[PDB]
Ligand binder design. Structure first.
Ligand SMILES: NC(=O)c1ccc[n+]([C@@H]2O[C@H](COP(=O)([O-])OP(=O)(O)OC[C@H]3O[C@@H](n4cnc5c(N)ncnc54)[C@H](OP(=O)(O)O)[C@@H]3O)[C@@H](O)[C@H]2O)c1
Ligand SMILES: CCc1nc(N)nc(N)c1OCCCOc1ccccc1CCC(=O)O
Length: 165
């Protein structure tokens, strides 16, 4: 069951070790995760920190088919094709389904408001570094399921987790 009144969800991909980002990029190749990310977010509102906006390739700025919302404390930051807001509150003003798409700073900020998480886990040798962007923890309030391990065209093992509360 999926709730549809001010539903806030978080969607991320992470290594088993908990890394979501390094040096400004997502440090692995899983094309099936791009497919999975689009499948969930397409047509919905997407919320993202300024760093994540910067990390997008110009060919996906803004993310097509989604209402793009960008969080920045910088007064007057321009995000062409996206709405820029200065608080988590202004970001989540819409009642339509809204997916927080990263990065770590925004996951940590939106997590008390979220009632769904869609997590890709990637089995990649990626020992965590203090400068990485890291995955948010999931406490015991979450119910959910975990898919089977699959193998990517890139050779990496991955699997999908889906949680809710
Ligand atoms: N694996 C995944 O699923 C995934 C998904 C998305 C991103 N990533 C990776 O994660 C990294 C980015 O994550 P990050 O945590 O470093 O950055 P981030 O969360 O994407 O963005 C950080 C920025 O958000 C703004 N911000 C934060 N809190 C705010 C608040 N309360 N009010 C207003 N604005 C606020 C600030 O922008 P200003 O400095 O402009 O003020 C801050 O610098 C990148 O390497 C990216 O590739 C991975
Ligand atoms: C696809 C990576 C990704 N995967 C999951 N499961 N959750 C995210 N929040 C996420 O990050 C979304 C922001 C970065 O997205 C991209 C990064 C590099 C190339 C293309 C895209 C997205 C393009 C699109 O979705 O249309």
């Amino acid at each position: 069951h999926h709730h549809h009144h001010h539903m806030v969800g978080l969607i991320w991909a992470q290594s088993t070790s908990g890394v979501i980002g390094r040096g400004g990029d997502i440090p692995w190749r899983v094309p099936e995760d791009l497919s999975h990310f689009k499948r969930i977010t397409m047509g919905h509102t997407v919320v993202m920190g300024r760093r994540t906006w910067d990390s997008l390739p110009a060919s996906a700025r803004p993310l097509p088919g989604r209402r793009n919302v960008v969080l920045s404390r910088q007064p007057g930051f321009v995000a062409e094709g996206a709405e820029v807001v200065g608080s988590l509150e202004d970001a989540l003003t819409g009642p339509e389904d809204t997916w927080v798409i990263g990065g770590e700073q925004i996951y940590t900020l939106a997590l008390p408001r979220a009632i769904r998480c869609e997590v890709t886990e990637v089995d990649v040798d990626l020992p965590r570094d203090d400068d990485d962007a890291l995955a948010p923890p999931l406490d015991e309030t979450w119910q959910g399921d975990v898919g089977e391990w699959q193998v990517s065209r890139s050779g990496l093992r991955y699997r999908f987790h889906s949680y809710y509360r």
